[PDB]
Amino acid sequence: GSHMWIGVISLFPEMFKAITEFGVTGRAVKHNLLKVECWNPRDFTFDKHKTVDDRPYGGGPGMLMMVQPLRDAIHTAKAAAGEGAKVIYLSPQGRKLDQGGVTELAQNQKLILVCGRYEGIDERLIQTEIDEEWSIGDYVLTGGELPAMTLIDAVARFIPGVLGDGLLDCPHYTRPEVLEGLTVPPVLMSGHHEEIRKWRLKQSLQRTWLRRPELLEGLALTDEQRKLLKEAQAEHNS
Amino acid sequence: GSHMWIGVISLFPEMFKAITEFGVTGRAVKHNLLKVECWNPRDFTFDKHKTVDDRPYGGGPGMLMMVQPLRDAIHTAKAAAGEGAKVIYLSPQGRKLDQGGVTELAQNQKLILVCGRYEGIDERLIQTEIDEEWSIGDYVLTGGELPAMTLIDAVARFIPGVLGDGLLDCPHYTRPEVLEGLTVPPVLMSGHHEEIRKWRLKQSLQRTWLRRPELLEGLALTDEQRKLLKEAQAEHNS
Ligand SMILES: Nc1nonc1C(=O)N1CCN(Cc2ccccn2)CC1
Numbered sequence: 001g002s003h004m005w006i007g008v009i010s011l012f013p014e015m016f017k018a019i020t021e022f023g024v025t026g027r028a029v030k031h032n033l034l035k036v037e038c039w040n041p042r043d044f045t046f047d048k049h050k051t052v053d054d055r056p057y058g059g060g061p062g063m064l065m066m067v068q069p070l071r072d073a074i075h076t077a078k079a080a081a082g083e084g085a086k087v088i089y090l091s092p093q094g095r096k097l098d099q100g101g102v103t104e105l106a107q108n109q110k111l112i113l114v115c116g117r118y119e120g121i122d123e124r125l126i127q128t129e130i131d132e133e134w135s136i137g138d139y140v141l142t143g144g145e146l147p148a149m150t151l152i153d154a155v156a157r158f159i160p161g162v163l164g165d166g167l168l169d170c171p172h173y174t175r176p177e178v179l180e181g182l183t184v185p186p187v188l189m190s191g192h193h194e195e196i197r198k199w200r201l202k203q204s205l206q207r208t209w210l211r212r213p214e215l216l217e218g219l220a221l222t223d224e225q226r227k228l229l230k231e232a233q234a235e236h237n238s
Numbered sequence: 239g240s241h242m243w244i245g246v247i248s249l250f251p252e253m254f255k256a257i258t259e260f261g262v263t264g265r266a267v268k269h270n271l272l273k274v275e276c277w278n279p280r281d282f283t284f285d286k287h288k289t290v291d292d293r294p295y296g297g298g299p300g301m302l303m304m305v306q307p308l309r310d311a312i313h314t315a316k317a318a319a320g321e322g323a324k325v326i327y328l329s330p331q332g333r334k335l336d337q338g339g340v341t342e343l344a345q346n347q348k349l350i351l352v353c354g355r356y357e358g359i360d361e362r363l364i365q366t367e368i369d370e371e372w373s374i375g376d377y378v379l380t381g382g383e384l385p386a387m388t389l390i391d392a393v394a395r396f397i398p399g400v401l402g403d404g405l406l407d408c409p410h411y412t413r414p415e416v417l418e419g420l421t422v423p424p425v426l427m428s429g430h431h432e433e434i435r436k437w438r439l440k441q442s443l444q445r446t447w448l449r450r451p452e453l454l455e456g457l458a459l460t461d462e463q464r465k466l467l468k469e470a471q472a473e474h475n476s
Pocket residue numbers: 090091092116117118119120121134135136137138139140141142143144145147407
């Protein structure tokens with residue numbers, strides 16, 4: 001349907017088996033809802049030792065990805081993708097990913113994700129080959145592979161067939177009715193669908209307010225949400 | 239040395255091969271700097287079909303992880319860990335992970351990471367078994383495995399032997415000297431180490447200011463940084 005094709009450039013393509021062979025994303029791939037295709041810069045090297053890193057001009061302790069194998073891998077992925085593929089570099093210097101950002105990226109039918117290693121890629125490749133730079137969070141990882149897999153997983157949820165409001169989630173409960181002395185809220189046992197809905201929404205508003213108050217600032221709360229939030233705050237203040 | 243032990247509770251333990259078998263984290267594991275040990279709730283089931291999900295009280299479209307197999311897996315991981323292990327649940331309702339948070343978690347010698355699937359785990363298990371809840375970002379994934387692997391990768395960088403200031407990174411350049419008409423900044427070719435240092439720091443300040451101005455607010459800039467930032471801003475304003 002709205003199937004998605006994601007090309008990946010990575011020195012460790014076998015890492016992506018974690019999403020292509022298991023769980024929800026694994027099923028998406030099996031059912032041809034998601035296609036993930038990997039190119040390894042190591043395969044585009046020509047020297048005997050298949051060199052994929054290179055020294056930075058200006059010195060320093062680190063290395064960068066070697067330009068020629070990486071550039072050639074990217075070009076190969078672009079040729080396979082055809083027209084309309086957006087090329088993404090994952091790094092801490094990119095636009096911070098959130099769910100709105102995920103929904104934006106998910107509108108793309110084709111993505112190419114470039115996974116950096118070492119101290120990253122040549123700035124001129126970012127200028128000449130990368131459409132958008134994104135970060136999955138303000139922390140530093142050993143490479144772009146986990147970020148790429150995280151992005152793939154998040155956007156995959158928006159492909160129709162893959163799955164079976166700005167607020168944090170409400171608490172959920174399952175069997176048994178009592179667990180180390182802790183009981184399930186009686187409302188959830190009541191069978192009263194409307195009370196249960198309002199209880200869940202109220203809990204969500206309360207948890208967002210207590211844990212992530214700044215998320216509430218970004219919202220235009222509905223009349224019902226304003227009411228339930230006021231109630232939750234009143235109860236919190238006893 | 240400051241080796242780290244990380245217990246993992248996951249319905250898809252084979253996903254963690256992406257970090258235990260490859261790259262920097264793979265080497266950490268091989269060199270016994272990092273130990274990652276997985277328990278699968280499916281192995282703690284007793285029914286013929288090894289059931290690991292259960293219906294939420296109060297209804298709704300989703301499922302939760304079944305309490306008994308998950309609880310038993312967690313208890314088993316805690317027994318293996320001995321004393322001092324901090325138990326973490328990964329979810330969008332948790333404390334937002336950043337590099338400071340990574341450095342905090344990395345001070346722990348033992349971690350147990352609980353990977354949720356479905357609509358997550360019973361709220362009472364969070365109360366009774368989880369020490370801390372963390373989020374790797376404000377977006378929704380299909381399960382806690384990629385978040386757990388991301389956390390493991392980030393904290394692993396702080397284990398001594400694993401690897402070979404609040405600002406975004408400077409641009410980096412490697413061979414060739416000219417790439418699609420784009421040249422390497424002459425300062426990086428100059429061999430003047432102090433000019434190169436100041437240029438890199440200035441670029442870092444400029445990029446942070448242009449891309450992530452709010453990160454600058456959280457910093458107490460050094461005298462040198464204040465100067466170079468003013469210069470970068472002056473040049474930006476031509
Ligand atoms: N945070 C993140 N959100 O996406 N990716 C990351 C992330 O930490 N990494 C690890 C280091 N990389 C290689 C690198 C190093 C320095 C500059 C540019 N590239 C990028 C991928």
